[PDB]
Amino acid sequence: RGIPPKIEALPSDISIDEGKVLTVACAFTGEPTPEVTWSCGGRKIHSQEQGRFHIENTDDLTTLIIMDVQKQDGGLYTLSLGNEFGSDSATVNIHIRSI
Partner 1 sequence: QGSPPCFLRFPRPVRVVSGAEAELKCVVLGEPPPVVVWEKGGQQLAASERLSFPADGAEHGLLLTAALPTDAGVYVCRARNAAGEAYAAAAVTVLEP
> In the complex, which residues of this chain contact partner 1 (CB under 8 A)?
8-16, 20-27, 61, 63
> At its nearest, how many Å lie between partner 1 and the CB of residue 97?
11
33 versus 63: smaller Cβ distance to partner 1: 63
> At its nearest, how many Å lie between partner 1 and the CB of residue 26?
7
Contact 67, 52 (CB under 8 A): yes
| CA–CA gap between residue 24 and residue 11 (Å, rounded) | 9
| CA–CA gap between residue 91 and residue 7 (Å, rounded) | 10
58 versus 72: smaller Cβ distance to partner 1: 58
Q: Which of 97, 59, 96, 61 is nearest to 79 (CA)?
A: 61
13 versus 31: smaller Cβ distance to partner 1: 13
